[PDB]
RNA sequence: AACGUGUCGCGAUGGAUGACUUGGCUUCCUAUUUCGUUGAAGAACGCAGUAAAGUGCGAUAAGUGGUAUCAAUUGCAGAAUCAUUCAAUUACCGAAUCUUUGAACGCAAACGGCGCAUGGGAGAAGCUCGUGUCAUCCCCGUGCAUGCCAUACUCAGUGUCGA
RNA sequence: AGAUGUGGCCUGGAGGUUAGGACGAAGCUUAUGGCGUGAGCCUAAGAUGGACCGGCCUCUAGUGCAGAUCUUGGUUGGCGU
RNA sequence: AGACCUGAGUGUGGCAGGACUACCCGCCGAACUUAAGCAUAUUACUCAGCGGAGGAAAAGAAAACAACCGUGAUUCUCUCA
């Protein structure tokens, strides 16, 4: 789950989740919040562990 | 801490300046995760010195692009295809106004009467 | 009746927000703003209300460019 | 003539201001022709016009305009004054020859004393209550 | 209801992020003027009508 | 600075709405007469870490080192000039630099360039 | 009306009258001035003070 | 008696008066003093370690550059050096940045919408001898409102000729 | 009703003069008396205040309240109804 | 075939559009009011409305005034009045 910029589509969020983070997004479900921000749920490709990515990010 | 001085930053090339811009956009992006997951007040708090040094790399990159493009259109007779972002921005009214190579244009007779009868300096006693 | 009961019969919106005016003055059936006359190129300005003239005037907002161009003229368009 | 555009010919108030059809505009049609050109072709500075032809319905005027951004006009001394931005719409302010006609500036002496430089320039001058300082 | 334009949703989102109180350290500055927020909007008392 | 003029309302506005480079000159202190007589300068803008002695107030006759020039509060902070709160914790008490003369200067080669500029010789 | 205009002779005859009364030492003294040690009224000094 | 009434002393309620005044109002003066398609004024949304409003600024976002100043800012944190520049801070200004709009101008519009040319990008399918290349899809730049002036090619006309 | 006179009183500021104030100015308070026909002035006491101000001669004006279904703020009987 | 004339289409280089509008230029243009009524007249060739510039604008270089012993572009001031 990431806050992304509110003027990106789901295709360019997948391509940024490949160049920053060396993982493969199979499904992005975006959501412009009542805060005003766009939140994306980004499911990884089951060849990539979610905790192993989230430790490298650190959270 | 890490803080790009601009005097050692203007001596870089266009490739090394971009390579240290991705270096510092990446370091800012992994402090936006410690700004959301708690964060010690020392690691966080390098957010201004990074974000103002990104502003120094981009102002060296952009001042080197307008310098190498203003010296691409004033070089020769290509100054009709000069894009208007590079032209001398004045007031809108001052660009349309008559230049002073113009506007002192005068008739062959108006030149003669200022040469046959010029305004004299004189006194009185 | 015309008092309390008829207040509940008011359902829609006459005006929505103006894309230019800023205000809740854009008429929906007649596509025109009650306050800045948008989409007309000129804005509403009437000397029978100078108090409204003094509210939509230069300097009531931010003046992003008249800040910079007034000192460009005051410093006589200097250039190194 | 000028039909007064009151709704349905109905107008109000004092009977001197009741007429609709016999009223006449205070600008001649040559000035009105020059203003319709220059309000329509904004990049051109019109200087004066002249009578061409009449019909029973229409009058025609050739209005001479000049392009102020043309490099010929800017470099030519006897026409480059038109490029200065005080002549931007000479027609809309009564500064052409037909404008100076309906202002009365064909006359100079005792026939124009109420209207030199303008009627408003003489109205203001003749009616402003002057307060001298020590009086 | 469900339909809103996104430009109305983003104006309604600004007013949620403005509806927060003055923090306490504002009240401890030198030339202080602000005790409370004077613009605390409540959804029932005053209507935005976007 | 030239704050004083004919109009009080304008003079008293340019004092209390002064930038911190104007507030530095306005927050000046005299020099001690063994130090005024050396540099031939009569007063000096106060820096941090230069030593002063206090001449007006309840803290008059107190020496010490300047630890903060708090220009927003128009005051100075000497370490040796302080008191305690209800907790027993100590807090530094502000003095205006009028009430204070300098007994040692903190010198840099931008501060040694102000003394050569104000040198009356 | 802020400013007033006074006749030219009546401004001159008022400057003269206030100038005549400076010679009277009773009127200079009854106006506040401490002239108790002054040599003479009208006091007149030399022009060496115009070079101090 | 009780209630009540009156007078003084002390309390409360109330927020006048005085003193104060970084504000208004009025007058007078000095200029290489007058915005915008090179996108203005206005409107919108954002930007701080902490930040609602306001101020300042624009994804370089409470600012970057340069000059002058010469050790702060300070509510609390943080911070190479503790100061001939190359990192205080403030003031000033030449170099820049300047989101979405708006005359608003590719077409629309209670749509963060959709084009036609053109260039760049990314590209886990294919093809290639993991590299390259890369179909749709998806991003980004630029050109394109209309009128007019000048201009250098393609035309229309049983307009007048002409072979 | 009205006119007029007043070395008649009072308030803000200005020109002059003469003086007060941290040993306590302005303001406020009154079973504080004094004296003026009166408008008013002055003293005293504050177990009040905390920094400005008086008198006289001239000059000037946004200069004197009890009521305008007066304006604005507050309070009150009705009423613990 | 070609020309000339009158019109098109694109390419290229430009410009106009909105803001301000105190003053100023062009138009448009009232009524309350005053006349102790009211209609001419007055308010006023003013308010409001529309268009257009500038640092000022507008005017200006005699188809002028005069009737003199003559004057000499415009603008403004005092006066004329
Ligand atoms: N005394 C009544 C007041 O008089 C004031 O005005 C007075 C004077 O200011 C005013 O004087 C005017 C003068 O101002 C103006 N500049 C010129 C005029 N010549 C003067 O008038 C003068 O001459 C006339 C006759 O010519 C006399 O009738 C008049 O009394 C005299 N003052 O005439 C009034 C006579 O005293 C105000 N109008 C006003 O405050 C009030 O009516
Ligand atoms: Mg005249
Ligand atoms: Mg559009
Ligand atoms: Mg009064
Ligand atoms: Mg316009
Ligand atoms: Mg009236
Ligand atoms: Mg009447
Ligand atoms: Mg008007
Ligand atoms: Mg002119």
Automatic annotation (TrEMBL), chain A:
One of its GO terms (biological process) is translation. Keywords: Metal-binding, Ribonucleoprotein, Ribosomal protein, RNA-binding, rRNA-binding. The keyword Plastid does not apply. Belongs to the universal ribosomal protein uL23 family. This is 60S ribosomal protein L23a, putative. Signal peptide: none annotated. The chain holds residues 86 to 144 of 145 of the full protein. One of its GO terms (cellular component) is ribonucleoprotein complex. One of its GO terms (molecular function) is rRNA binding.
UniProtKB/TrEMBL annotation, chain B:
Keywords: Ribonucleoprotein, Ribosomal protein. GO terms for molecular function: mRNA binding; structural constituent of ribosome. One of its GO terms (biological process) is maturation of LSU-rRNA from tricistronic rRNA transcript (SSU-rRNA, 5.8S rRNA, LSU-rRNA). Pfam families: Ribosomal_L29. CDD domains: Ribosomal_L29_HIP. GO terms for cellular component: cytosolic large ribosomal subunit. NCBIfam families: L29. PANTHER family: 60S RIBOSOMAL PROTEIN L35 (PTHR45722), LARGE RIBOSOMAL SUBUNIT PROTEIN UL29-RELATED (PTHR45722:SF2). Belongs to the universal ribosomal protein uL29 family. This is 60S ribosomal protein L35, putative. It comes from Leishmania donovani.
UniProtKB/TrEMBL annotation, chain D:
The keyword Ribonucleoprotein applies. The keyword ATP-binding does not apply. One of its GO terms (cellular component) is cytosolic large ribosomal subunit. Keywords: Ribonucleoprotein, Ribosomal protein. GO terms for molecular function: RNA binding; structural constituent of ribosome. Residues 92-111 are annotated as: Disordered. It comes from the Eukaryota. One of its GO terms (biological process) is cytoplasmic translation. Residues 99-111 have a biased composition (Basic residues). Belongs to the eukaryotic ribosomal protein eL15 family. This is Ribosomal protein L15. The chain holds residues 70 to 204 of 204 of the full protein.
TrEMBL record, chain G:
It comes from the Eukaryota. Belongs to the universal ribosomal protein uL4 family. This is Ribosomal protein L1a, putative. It comes from Leishmania donovani.
């Amino acid at each position: 789950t990431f806050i992304v910029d509110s003027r990106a589509n789901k295709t360019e969020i997948k391509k940024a989740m490949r160049k920053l983070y060396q993982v493969k997004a199979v499904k992005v479900n975006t959501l412009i919040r009542p805060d005003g921000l766009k939140k994306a749920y980004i499911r990884l490709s089951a060849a990539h562990d979610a905790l192993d990515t989230a430790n490298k990010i650190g959270l | 801490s890490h803080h790009m001085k601009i005097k050692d930053l203007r001596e870089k090339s266009k490739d090394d300046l971009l390579k240290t811009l991705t270096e510092y956009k990446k370091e800012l992006s992994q402090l936006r995760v410690v700004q959301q997951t708690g964060g010690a007040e020392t690691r966080l708090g390098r957010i201004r010195p990074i974000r103002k040094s990104i502003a120094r790399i981009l102002t060296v990159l952009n001042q080197n692009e307008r310098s190498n493009l203003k010296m691409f259109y004033a070089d020769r007779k290509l100054r009709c295809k000069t894009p208007k972002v590079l032209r001398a921005k004045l007031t809108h009214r001052r660009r349309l106004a008559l230049k002073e190579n113009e506007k002192n244009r005068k008739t062959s007779r108006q030149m003669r009467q200022a040469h046959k009868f010029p305004k004299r300096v004189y006194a009185v006693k | 009746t015309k008092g309390t009961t008829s207040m509940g019969q008011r359902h829609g919106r006459t005006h929505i927000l103006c894309r230019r005016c800023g205000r809740n003055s854009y008429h929906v059936q007649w596509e025109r703003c009650a306050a800045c006359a948008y989409p007309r190129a000129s804005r509403r300005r009437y000397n029978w209300s100078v108090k409204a003239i003094k509210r939509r005037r230069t300097g009531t907002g931010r003046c992003r460019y008249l800040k910079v161009v007034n000192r460009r003229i005051a410093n006589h368009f200097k250039t190194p | 003539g000028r039909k007064r555009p009151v709704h349905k010919g109905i107008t109000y108030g004092k009977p001197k201001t009741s007429g609709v059809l016999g009223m006449k505009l205070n600008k001649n049609n040559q000035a009105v022709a020059e203003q319709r050109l220059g309000k329509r072709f904004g990049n051109l500075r019109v200087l004066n016009s002249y009578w061409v032809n009449m019909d029973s319905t229409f009058k025609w005027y050739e209005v001479i305009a000049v392009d102020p951004m043309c490099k010929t006009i800017r470099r030519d001394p006897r026409i480059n004054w038109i490029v200065n931005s005080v002549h931007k719409h000479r027609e809309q302010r009564g500064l052409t020859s037909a404008g100076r006609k309906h202002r009365g500036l064909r006359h100079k002496g005792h026939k124009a004393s109420k209207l030199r430089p303008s009627y408003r320039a003489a109205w203001r001058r003749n009616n402003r209550i002057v307060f001298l300082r020590k009086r | 209801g469900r339909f809103k334009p996104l430009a109305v949703k983003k104006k309604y989102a600004k007013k949620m992020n403005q509806n927060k109180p003055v923090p306490y350290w504002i009240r401890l500055r030198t030339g202080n003027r602000i005790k409370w927020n004077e613009k605390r909007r409540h959804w029932r008392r005053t209507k935005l009508n976007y | 600075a030239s704050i004083k003029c004919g109009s009080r309302r304008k003079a008293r506005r340019a004092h209390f709405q002064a930038p911190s480079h104007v507030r530095r000159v306005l927050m000046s202190a005299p020099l001690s007469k063994e130090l005024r007589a050396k540099y031939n300068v009569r007063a000096m803008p106060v820096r941090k870490d230069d030593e002063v002695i206090v001449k007006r107030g309840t803290f008059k006759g107190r020496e010490g080192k300047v630890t903060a020039c708090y220009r927003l509060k128009w005051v100075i902070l000497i370490d040796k000039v302080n008191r305690e709160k209800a907790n027993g914790s100590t807090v530094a008490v502000g003095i205006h630099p009028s009430n204070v003369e300098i007994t040692k200067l903190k010198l840099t080669h931008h501060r040694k360039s102000i003394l050569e500029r104000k040198d009356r010789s | 009306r802020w400013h007033r205009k006074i006749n030219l002779h009546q401004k001159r005859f008022a400057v003269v009258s206030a100038l005549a009364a400076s010679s009277v030492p009773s009127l200079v003294m009854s106006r506040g001035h401490r002239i108790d040690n002054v040599p003479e009224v009208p006091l007149v000094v030399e022009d060496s003070i115009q070079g101090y």
